[PDB]
Design a binder for this molecule. Sequence first.
Ligand SMILES: C[C@H](N)C(=O)NS(=O)(=O)OC[C@H]1O[C@@H](n2cnc3c(N)ncnc32)[C@H](O)[C@@H]1O
Ligand SMILES: C[C@H](N)C(=O)NS(=O)(=O)OC[C@H]1O[C@@H](n2cnc3c(N)ncnc32)[C@H](O)[C@@H]1O
Ligand SMILES: [Mg+2]
Ligand SMILES: [Mg+2]
Ligand SMILES: [Mg+2]
Lengths: 905, 905
Amino acid sequence: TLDEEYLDITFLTENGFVRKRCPKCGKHFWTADPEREICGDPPCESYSFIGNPVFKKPFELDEMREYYLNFFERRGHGRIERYPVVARWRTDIYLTIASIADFQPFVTSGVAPPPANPLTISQPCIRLDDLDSVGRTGRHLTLFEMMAHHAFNYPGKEIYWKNETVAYCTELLNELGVKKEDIVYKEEPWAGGGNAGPCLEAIVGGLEVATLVFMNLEEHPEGDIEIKGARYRKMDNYIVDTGYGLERFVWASKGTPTVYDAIFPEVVDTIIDNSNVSFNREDERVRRIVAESSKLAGIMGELRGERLNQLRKSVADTVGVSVEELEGIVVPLEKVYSLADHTRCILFMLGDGLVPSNAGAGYLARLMIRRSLRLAEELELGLDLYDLVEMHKKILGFEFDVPLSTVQEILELEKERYRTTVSKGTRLVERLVERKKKLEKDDLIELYDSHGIPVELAVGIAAEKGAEVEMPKDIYAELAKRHSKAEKVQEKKITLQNEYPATEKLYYDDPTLLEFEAEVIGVEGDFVILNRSAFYPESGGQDNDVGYLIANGGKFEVVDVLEADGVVLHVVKGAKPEVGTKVKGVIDSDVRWRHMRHHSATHVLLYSLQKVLGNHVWQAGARKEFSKARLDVTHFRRPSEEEIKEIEMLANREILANKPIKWEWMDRIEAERKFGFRLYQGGVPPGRKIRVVQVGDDVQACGGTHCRSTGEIGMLKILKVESIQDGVIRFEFAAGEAAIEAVEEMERLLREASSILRVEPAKLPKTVERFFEEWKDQRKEIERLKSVIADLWADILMERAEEFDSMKVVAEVVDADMQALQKLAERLAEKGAVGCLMAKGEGKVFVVTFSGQKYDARELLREIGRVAKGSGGGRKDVAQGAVQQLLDREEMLDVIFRFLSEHEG
Amino acid sequence: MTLDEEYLDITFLTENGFVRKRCPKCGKHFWTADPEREICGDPPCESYSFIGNPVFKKPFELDEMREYYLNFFERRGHGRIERYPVVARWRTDIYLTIASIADFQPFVTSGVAPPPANPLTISQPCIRLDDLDSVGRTGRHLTLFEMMAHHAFNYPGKEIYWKNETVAYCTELLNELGVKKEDIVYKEEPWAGGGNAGPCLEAIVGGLEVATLVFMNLEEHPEGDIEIKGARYRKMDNYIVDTGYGLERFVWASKGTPTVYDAIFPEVVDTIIDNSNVSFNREDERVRRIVAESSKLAGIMGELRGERLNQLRKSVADTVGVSVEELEGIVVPLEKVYSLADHTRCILFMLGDGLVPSNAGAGYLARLMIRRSLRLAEELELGLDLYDLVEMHKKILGFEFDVPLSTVQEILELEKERYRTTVSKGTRLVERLVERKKKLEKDDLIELYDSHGIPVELAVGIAAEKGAEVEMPKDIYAELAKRHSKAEKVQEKKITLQNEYPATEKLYYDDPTLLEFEAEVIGVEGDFVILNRSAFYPESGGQDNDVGYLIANGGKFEVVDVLEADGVVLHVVKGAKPEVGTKVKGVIDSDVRWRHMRHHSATHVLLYSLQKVLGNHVWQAGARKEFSKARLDVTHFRRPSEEEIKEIEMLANREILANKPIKWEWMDRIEAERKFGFRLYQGGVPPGRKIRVVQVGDDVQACGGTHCRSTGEIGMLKILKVESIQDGVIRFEFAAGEAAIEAVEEMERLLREASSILRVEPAKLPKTVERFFEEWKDQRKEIERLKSVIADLWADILMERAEEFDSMKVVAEVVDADMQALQKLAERLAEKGAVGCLMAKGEGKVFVVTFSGQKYDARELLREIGRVAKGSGGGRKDVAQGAVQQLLDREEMLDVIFRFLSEHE
RNA sequence: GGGCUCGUAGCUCAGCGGGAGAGCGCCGCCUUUGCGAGGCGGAGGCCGCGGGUUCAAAUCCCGCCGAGUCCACCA
Ligand SMILES: C[C@H](N)C(=O)NS(=O)(=O)OC[C@H]1O[C@@H](n2cnc3c(N)ncnc32)[C@H](O)[C@@H]1O
Ligand SMILES: C[C@H](N)C(=O)NS(=O)(=O)OC[C@H]1O[C@@H](n2cnc3c(N)ncnc32)[C@H](O)[C@@H]1O
Ligand SMILES: [Mg+2]
Ligand SMILES: [Mg+2]
Ligand SMILES: [Mg+2]
């Protein structure tokens, strides 16, 4: 089945390679060396290159990049400069995980042409899955550059297939110098990004250096072929993908112990020299143990547990090192690398415009910051993360859209935030100890999953305090991952009951027209469809163009209009003319104008937002209703009043400039070349051609209706600024007359309030404060006076209290509300009275009982309830409740005596 | 002079067939066609005889006579022009159009501007308030009247026709109409008014001056060679024909009725009679006889008052054979129905042409006519409103007005509310003044109306009532009108101190955007620099001026303020003073000119809005830019509702969004007025044959100053304040553009701060204020209630703690409390039928009170107690108050209580 | 995108259906030479907003607002 693909490869059989199989029932693979065998012990060999350059000469990062790019430039394929590490153009995935991910999936589905063919690129990529592996395996990074050649093939016409792909790999390595006998081609199944295919993964010197995937299939519901839990289907067209790890590539050029040393030596050095590490990097014994341990690092990743300690023993003896000695170096190093790597990863994340958050894309950046800070704390680093990030910056020497200054601010803020959280969380744990005297796992998940507190802090406080502990691993995911239920399975929009072809809208090129000439094709329920619509349908925000539709008979009312694919729907809550009529649709001007203005204003505010705040801001979302509009952007903190005032100002300045607005349909490639990725702030559009709107400076892919110039949108008013989530901020605004009325309404609310207190609008806050102060004062004084009433009331009531064995009993029907009854009772109880008071209320009577002695006020109230038909409760000294039947004093006294008799001896 | 020129020159005066003669008593020269009969046509020599024997071939109607006159002179070669408004918008000397000549002075009459056409013919409505007293009495005088007139302008050169030809045209019409050549008499006299004047000939037919033909060749001047009514008048280069025809007097002399009112608007006169308190019947024949005879001689008696009038009224009363005391019964109220109806007419034209009643300006004249009319209504006890009569007029005439009827109705209803309200408080003043003064004087009367708004007749009524003599001269309404009817000069500090320079140059008219210029500086006097060319802006307003600096090779010169004089620029400078004849590049601040641009254009769009929303009575009183703000004054009869405020703002902002072009250009005065109407002069009146027309949208105005190109350039408008300073004129404070945004941000800040201090969302602030308020009120009443309850309760416990003697509860205690406590409890003790004493060790002397709800005297106890503790006091039979030096034990108080009770009763 | 956690005195919190409470901070007094505090007091609160439940809501339920936190779709 699958093999039929692999054996077809030309290079393997004719040029000089063979296919073989392993002892463990794992897989097939290819070699040119007919001589030697893997032991049969799972991963028998991990590395050879360590201590031995397998390249002809040590390369540096830039050198490797250029050697690769030009080797490939000379040979017939176009160079394309890298994409950002953030998948702005995609929705399905946050960050760039592979080189192929750049062009996915419109280009890979044939929908759009690649910018060149074949092409090549050193594309940075981020994987966060291998987080456990990183710093321990010696070959993994969170952030790396993956370089590629991609050839895009259509049925009958293909630049190249498998043969040139494998060829290029073999010739590239050979030009470097590694003999064909030393390169091993492992076959494997490759899936990811909605596309997939079989892949030859090149390992040399024991290290996977490369992977070339042959994309034959795509993710699809039918899913005849199944893999990685996902469903896939054979394509009509095929694409080649080629991943080459540079960081690993330079590593095999230097033969250093770990890739980290090969890529950023100086950073690792800075960390180790300014830390709490016991040892020195220089001396022999730590050099020997690192050399040999590095050799087995590629093994230790795959094998863990009992074997891990066993292999640790094997290498410990190999170097002649105690059980405690080696991991005394291995463990701190495993953290040093992780920290060094993460800092490099932080760099690209922030620099490419990703803003830390508590959810969504930004949370990833936050996470990396968090971990970096934990590691920094554990190493007692004498520097701040910013220093390390700056080092990586100089070292790689790249240039970013986001300034390093903003990066520092973000690091400082995120750090300070974390410090706040660990503080508050810590204090909580202390309270938890005092309350429960022991820590349990079910609470432990809450500590991390809902307070962001690592178990090492919980256990590291409980043990610090002697509190009981249970630390169960492998369960952190157990609850969050395994309980989750989706509601709807089928497609997003409501599917048609019948198809209509040739639907189109000519409001794109021309927006001055509300009017148009057309014919009608279809009618369903309370909503109808036509052939050419000036009618723009409603978005998530109201985005709706009202109007009417004249018939050849009468004027019929469009109350609302939506959209289906290749269809425009017009909801009419009145009579339906049916298929017969030939019709001119006439759209209301005021709405078209207002929506135009709010669209253009949306763009203007975005433009103003980036210029005032920084390049790191990107539209997270946007929606609009009647007399209101909103725009979500990425910013690490709610702006100060100054900052938003200036934003308002600059926005209005942009209005008064009255700059021209131009929008032109175009193919995706040319647009992407022209403007950068700021084009996709409004989402990613389907189709071969896109509608490009240019508001003079800010350019974006928008299907929305727009003004001719900016002078038309009128003034712009920011209505409300709120921080949705950390790192995302919503701006509520209005423009045109929808703003002036929004202002006028605002004026009203002021005047009205002023008029109520008969005072000048300017002095409203000062008078309202004065009142509020007086209001609190008066509210208090009443509480004092009410206490006086009660105290006086008590003494009045005891004077007439019948005595009962040196106790004074009181039972009356008073004139007071429940709170007064209660305060009175509390006073009587304090003075050792016994009895109950009642008061006429509302559809009920309020009962209060009381005792200042051994007698329980609750039991007395239940007895009162039996005679008066009602229920309540309270404490030993007072009890509150309600009854339906008011009682005479005599009847109440009967009961009290009956109660008092029960309880002496 | 002007004998020889016009007694013989004209073909009519000697050739055609006519003769002059003078009468010794008359002291006048008249021009007659029948030598057989001599007559004077001005009292006391002649009374009219035409009435009852209509001298025209046919009676006419107002509409028929008007168009007939027009088409005559049209066919005779004149150009027709529509009526001018009854308010002098086009000039500054006065408020109201005195004559047809008034329409064209001083700008056409001084040859500064061309006439609309030549020759021309109009039916121009005029108000003349000097003859106000004569209205109703003479039966020929009217306050408001169409003057039919034909004009032609002749400079020292060409001419349309001359006096021979004009008197030719008038005899042409007259003879055509049925009046004989022979009877018509031409009375020689001067004619003055409105800064112009000349020798005139008054055409009289059947004892009534019907036409007036004035030839003017002079102009008012300080030389004033010729003395004309104390006014100095001197010959003008150009010469000009000015005619006058009373349309009324024509239709009057055509129908042959008794009093002009009875033939131009009989319907009004009859209806007032029908709904007044007049006792007699107009239909009745005997009264038709006496009016007919009274009307024959009404002309003379109108100009006679006192006892001389009584003799005239006797001389007529006899010739009919009716008694004087009876005759008063028709003449004194029927002249009053005449006055009200004519006034009502005058009200229609005054208000219908954009007047709004006020205590100053032409609104004063409108108010006057209304107030007097109201007074007449009460003198007739009319069952109607004035508006009924006004509407009747509007129908009768068929004229269409700028100001609609609904508005004039509202004005009138309000004015009557004012009137009754201002006589109610004005009435006491006459009660004190009449006996205080013992007699009534002219200045007293004038002071009464002009200050206290008390019409003459009320004052006279009480003066007669409380035995005080009254001297009411003839034409006193001439006094009140004349004294206030001059448009104030509003003269300001002017300084054109000698500099020997005539013609300067300003470059900012054509383009405001430019901000830099270069020129040669001539003239330095004192501080102020002056120049040949500049781009700065002067104003004596005290604002809207430009500011800046100048750099030459010498140094920098800072101009803080810039002024003007006799058309010459002024540049104040503190710092370095420049050298004459220096090349200097002038630079102004952009923003200062920018604000001013924004304000100026915003003002004009405001006036536009106010006119569109409220009415066509909306004009201006002034405009100033107090720094950091702005203000506009507008004629309106009441404070605008907040709803109206909202729609002013909304409409004007709506226009701002529209961004309509704002064009400036020069235009001929006659052409501009022909194209736009007299709204053009709302900002004032510009001189010259050409004027700087400004268009800010629909609104057209003649302000020479900076402006913005488009409405959008001034952005949102905000309305700061609204106030009434004097009746009729309402003031708006407004900001636009940047200051607008500052104001709104301030508005929002207040609202946000109030909402903040009450922990509430701003949109719910008003409702949450009234709750807090109502709570602050309720809890406030609540407090005193509780304090009263404390007192109520406290007396009740003391009755219990008391002792019994004579079955009367005696209570004597010491308590720690102030005075008002001791009183507010003693009253309740006596109210509960108790007797006793209470004491308090207050700060300083001890406080003591006594009380008795029985027949015992509270005061007496205090006498006794106070004799033992060393102090006295006082009280009543129920309670007694006292202050004393020593506190007492309870048991010692019981002694004085017991002793007392024992001694009395 | 999906869960969970928390809003109470200035701060840090406990109270989780029938009294608004503790530590620290603040104010006063007392004792103390152990200048640090100790003893006895006092001030300080719409228990975040809207509702529903009940005789009764700081307390229970639902919604909002705000502040937190983890996980989530990567040969
Ligand atoms: C291109 C294909 N879609 C693909 O992604 N194949 S791959 O996942 O195996 O990656 C190819 C090369 O990228 C590099 N690479 C992958 N994951 C890495 C990591 N976590 N750290 C450093 N390099 C990595 C390796 O050199 C690897 O051979
Ligand atoms: C034409 C010249 N400028 C002029 O105004 N002469 S005048 O003062 O006598 O008025 C001209 C005509 O207006 C009419 N008229 C003047 N005063 C009037 C009044 N108080 N009421 C009614 N008509 C009047 C007379 O018909 C008169 O002939
Ligand atoms: Mg708190
Ligand atoms: Mg409670
Ligand atoms: Mg202390």
